[PDB]
Amino acid sequence: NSTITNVAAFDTKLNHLLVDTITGRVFVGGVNRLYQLSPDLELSETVKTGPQNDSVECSILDCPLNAVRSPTDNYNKVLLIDRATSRLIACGSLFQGTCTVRNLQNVSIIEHEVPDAVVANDANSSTVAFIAPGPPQHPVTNVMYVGVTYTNNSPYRSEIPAVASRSLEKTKMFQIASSAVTTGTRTFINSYARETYFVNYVYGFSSERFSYFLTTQLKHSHHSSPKEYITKLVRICQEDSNYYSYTEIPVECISDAQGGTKFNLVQAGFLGKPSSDLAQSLGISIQDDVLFAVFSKGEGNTPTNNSALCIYSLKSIRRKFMQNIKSCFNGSGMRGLDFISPSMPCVLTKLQTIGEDFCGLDVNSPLGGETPITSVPVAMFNTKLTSVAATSTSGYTVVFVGTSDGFLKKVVIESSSIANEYASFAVDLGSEINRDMQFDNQNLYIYVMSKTKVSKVKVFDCSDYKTCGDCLGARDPYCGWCSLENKCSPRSNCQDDANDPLYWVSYKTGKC
Amino acid sequence: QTKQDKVLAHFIGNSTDYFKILDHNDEFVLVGAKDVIYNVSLNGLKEIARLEWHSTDADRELCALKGKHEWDCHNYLRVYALRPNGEVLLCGTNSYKPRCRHYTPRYEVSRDVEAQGLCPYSPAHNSTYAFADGHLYSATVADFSGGDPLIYRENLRTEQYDLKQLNQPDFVGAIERNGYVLFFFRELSMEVMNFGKAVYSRVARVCKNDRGGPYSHGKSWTSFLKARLNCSVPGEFPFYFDEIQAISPIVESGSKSLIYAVFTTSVNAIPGSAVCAFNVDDILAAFDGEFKSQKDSQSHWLPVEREQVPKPRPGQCVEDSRTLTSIAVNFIKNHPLMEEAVPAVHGRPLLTKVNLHHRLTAIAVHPQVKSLSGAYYDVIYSGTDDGKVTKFINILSTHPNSTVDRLKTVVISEMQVLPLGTPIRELVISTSKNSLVVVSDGSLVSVPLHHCSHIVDCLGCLSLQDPICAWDLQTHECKNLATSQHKFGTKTYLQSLNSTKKAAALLCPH
Ligand SMILES: *[C@@H]1O[C@H](CO)[C@@H](O[C@@H]2O[C@H](CO)[C@@H](O[C@@H]3O[C@H](CO[C@H]4O[C@H](CO)[C@@H](O)[C@H](O)[C@@H]4O)[C@@H](O)[C@H](O[C@H]4O[C@H](CO)[C@@H](O)[C@H](O)[C@@H]4O)[C@@H]3O)[C@H](O)[C@H]2NC(C)=O)[C@H](O)[C@H]1NC(C)=O
Ligand SMILES: *[C@@H]1O[C@H](CO)[C@@H](O[C@@H]2O[C@H](CO)[C@@H](O[C@@H]3O[C@H](CO[C@H]4O[C@H](CO)[C@@H](O)[C@H](O)[C@@H]4O)[C@@H](O)[C@H](O[C@H]4O[C@H](CO)[C@@H](O)[C@H](O)[C@@H]4O)[C@@H]3O)[C@H](O)[C@H]2NC(C)=O)[C@H](O)[C@H]1NC(C)=O
Ligand SMILES: *[C@@H]1O[C@H](CO)[C@@H](O)[C@H](O)[C@H]1NC(C)=O
Ligand SMILES: *[C@@H]1O[C@H](CO)[C@@H](O)[C@H](O)[C@H]1NC(C)=O
Ligand SMILES: *[C@@H]1O[C@H](CO)[C@@H](O)[C@H](O)[C@H]1NC(C)=O
Ligand SMILES: *[C@@H]1O[C@H](CO)[C@@H](O)[C@H](O)[C@H]1NC(C)=O
């Protein structure tokens, strides 16, 4: 195939994938393995991370009686790059979720080994980690925001928070960033809900002085109601060194079809920028952020083959958080988040200037919003969608969507209402496409990772359209047709030397 | 309805402030109030010194901003302690932003710092503390919203939001004893598998040489244990008083150390009050029995299986608690409640007031008043929520009407001290000045501890049945036996306590 450029097949099962934004090097974290590659998927270094002797009942320092360490696999759970200090962060499942700090030029080198329990020690329990501004100092130092699911397999697991900010200082590596006697940059799930109410962390991102987590979880903690799974959005102010601003609102992607259809289970997320046309529909500037996410209707907690693509602007996300916060501080309703501590009523407050930047106070502090942010999907699909990525190199936004069956689909989004597929092909047939799907630095190639392979896929190829009815017929937003030369190519490739403005024509603006 | 008492002195402030005895000697008492703290002489309830500390206008605008009222946004002084160097530790609520200061000598501010977990936010009588061996043990809330109760010392706290250790408690007192610190409070019941918003009263304990567990446990207690207090009426038809209201300091009644407590019934129940007393040895002995099992999905099991208790029993004070095992510290954090309930002295309440209009609210005891026969009786003072003080003793008549010993309550007097509606918050006894200081929200009133001098009639002196007043027959004066000297073989003095009150009067001739 000519659309796929490079293919790298690995020996183990792959877990994560990131691209260095300035050097374009590729880092792949997998089961018992850890690989570094060049921008063309040429292997540079490979690191054996397992297996090692380990039991879930034991920590590194002590192993209780009648328990024995046995060789177990080391699933990679976190893969991150620090920009200020050139060093790679990789966390494994062994030893209660340990992180190592490796050199960026050569991942084989270990620079710092920490013993702190940071990440889920399960093979399937989620873990989401991104680096963004935070305390202790005012936002000149970055921290690691981590969200971990309670694996429920060890007594040492209670020690690990569910959401927390963690320091990147050499002296205090991976410790909670700011902690005091009664408060800190940390949220635990209470002893009564910890073993029953689990939280699945899907995606994490930072936008406009706030840290975000996209989660799936049970709507209710008490057993008074039947089990319903919802998608939530966890937020914290980055200046906040107390998590006074820990707040959640639910996320609904609702459809007209079959009466009421709720795509309750989110599968993957991607934060990106809109196009000229799309920014007008959402009522935002082109420099503003848009959240792209793929939701799947789920039988219980299991996603079905009935997915949908939903977009959310962060102006409406911030205005929905503000809507839930304003309402609590006006005394209406219950604070929520009964699975942190018993839910007490919202207090009436004299607060007069709660805005989009509200950063939290002592009162109504851990707030659980009930008013959801709602969106109607621009596209629906007959397969389970497992990844999402968005680029606006062309004048239009194109969303790249990965299939659990191994297919890549491209959707062009012209409005909050109108969008449709213009391409669809298999990258690794029979192999679910991983959630970590990232572009090249120029957004010209996209890295698609399946179970055991990584494929460098070209974002557009207009040269393979010989005749012109094929160029405009492909309905590719990247492809137009120069009148003079017989080449299909984008606008920049044609020469406006021709007198007629119909030198370059799009697939919907004219006829060839 | 009720005779008013002979008020000796008074010390009045507004009703808006909220007095809290923060230290008491027989000569002086310290009173924390709305924006000041008073040093008051017990000689005439006269102010001797004052230390004013007002919340800044910005700090108290923040309080009203977060949904509070004017009367809540003040700096209610609520913690006092004289440090071993002459320094003065003084903390206040500071409009729901508690602060602590270090005054050094008059006084001058030497340190100011946050006090979350060291000092309540609200002026309510919800909290307590004990400055034991140069360290403040605090039992309060650490959050503005009041949903994070804890027991905090320097670098050690209970588990945040752990309801098996503390479930919405109201602390009533704290005692230092024998290398432990005891905390008295009422709590929500999650102990029983079928709990339904019931309130039970606990006594808790922490070792003073606790230094936290190993590794991550280094900031939490390795010795926190609690037991239920049993203040019930026994028999075929039990009657429980489950909400503890006030305790007393440890009282040395002969060879027994006792703690006296006031209990009441829950709301939407048969209204009633009681006074109970618990031996200090019975309190500590309960922490040596079985632990109560945690809640599971089956909920059909005995207390903790005794095969799960580690070889060094949890709760004992080890020299370095940082050497314990993760198994041991996690155990005591999952089994902080003892199985056995602390029994009461005589196995029943010493006084009961059921279905009356008023409730008992405070307690104080004058121990070991030697009667005319040479018997020692503790004299018990209990104040009501409508401003009365009840005085009484207990006599354990051996086989008076049955083979089982029968305990009887001898009520000496129940007089009105404060105006008809005002709740008595605390009581402080000065055995030296023969004065009883009654504490309300905005006043202190002193009354006579013993009324021997006031009465002049023979019938009154014997009907009073005070163990310290007896009628002389050479002198017509009803005399105080503390200053008098009987000789066991003289028919001079006359006193009747075991009989009825009318029977005591018949002993008076003519
Ligand atoms: C409420 O207000 C009352 C009255 O203002 C305070 O009571 C006074 O408290 C001060 C401070 O403790 C007392 O001063 C101390 O007196 C001690 C005893 O003094 C008597 O005995 C000596 C001989 O032993 C006589 O010379 C003297 O005239 C008295 O008859 C002294 O021993 C103390 O000195 C020691 O301590 C200081 C401080 O560390 C050291 O610097 C000295 O070097 C020395 O070691 C001290 O002088 C005063 O006597 C009290 N007055 C009364 C009438 O009781 C209360 O303290 C206050 N409430 C609270 C809670 O403080
Ligand atoms: C607060 O404090 C009060 C008083 O201190 C407690 O009341 C006691 O409660 C216990 C149990 O709740 C009572 O003890 C029970 O006695 C029952 C019958 O006793 C009669 O029969 C025995 C037979 O030898 C006689 O000796 C005795 O004198 C009585 O005539 C028993 O049926 C109870 O069950 C246990 O023993 C039997 C027999 O061995 C077993 O079959 C059972 O399975 C079980 O093991 C128990 O022995 C006691 O009598 C009460 N005392 C009083 C004065 O009322 C409260 O319980 C306490 N509250 C709390 C919360 O702690
Ligand atoms: C622990 O590792 C050793 C290798 O040093 C291995 O031989 C042994 O089998 C492991 N333990 C168990 C219980 O398998
Ligand atoms: C990278 O690190 C490994 C292990 O220390 C070493 O063998 C190798 O020589 C280093 N450099 C390169 C270019 O591989
Ligand atoms: C983890 O997930 C994989 C794929 O869904 C599955 O094959 C495996 O059995 C799971 N492991 C556990 C312990 O559930
Ligand atoms: C969903 O589609 C994928 C194709 O990638 C397939 O593996 C899976 O079996 C399908 N499930 C159902 C229920 O159709």
Author numbering:
A (entry chain A): 62 to 573
B (entry chain B): 43 to 147, 165 to 569
Original authors' sentences:
Semaphorin ligands interact with plexin receptors to contribute to functions in the development of myriad tissues including neurite guidance and synaptic organisation within the nervous system. Cell‐attached semaphorins interact in trans with plexins on opposing cells, but also in cis on the same cell. We have discovered a distinct mode of interaction through which the Drosophila semaphorin Sema1b and mouse Sema6A mediate binding in cis to their cognate plexin receptors. Sema1a and Sema1b are most closely related to the mammalian class 6 semaphorins and interact with the sole Drosophila class A plexin, PlexA.
We next determined crystal structures of the PlexA1‐4‐Sema1b1‐2 complex from two different crystal forms (1:1 complex and 2:2 complex) at 3.0 and 4.8 Å resolution. The 1:1 complex crystal lattice contains one PlexA1‐4 monomer and one Sema1b1‐2 monomer per asymmetric unit. The crystal packing provides no Sema1b1‐2 dimerisation resembling that of the generic homodimeric architecture. The Sema1b1‐2 bound in the 1:1 complex with PlexA1‐4 is very similar to the unbound Sema1b1‐2 with the Cα rmsd of 0.81 Å indicating no large conformational changes upon complex formation. Only small differences in loop orientations at the ligand–receptor interface are apparent. The PlexA1‐4 structure in the 1:1 complex contains a sema domain composed of a seven‐bladed β‐propeller fold, which is followed by a PSI domain; however, we were not able to locate the IPT1‐PSI2 domain segment. The sema domain of PlexA is most similar to mouse PlxnA2 with an rmsd of 1.43 Å over 424 matched Cα positions. In the 1:1 complex crystal structure, PlexA1‐4 and Sema1b1‐2 interact through their sema domains in a head‐to‐head orientation similar to the generic architecture shared by all reported structures of semaphorin–plexin complexes (Janssen et al, 2010; Liu et al, 2010; Nogi et al, 2010). The PlexA1‐4‐Sema1b1‐2 interface buries a total solvent‐accessible area of 1,837 Å2. This extensive interface is composed of a mixture of hydrophobic and hydrophilic interactions similar to that of PlxnA2‐Sema6A.
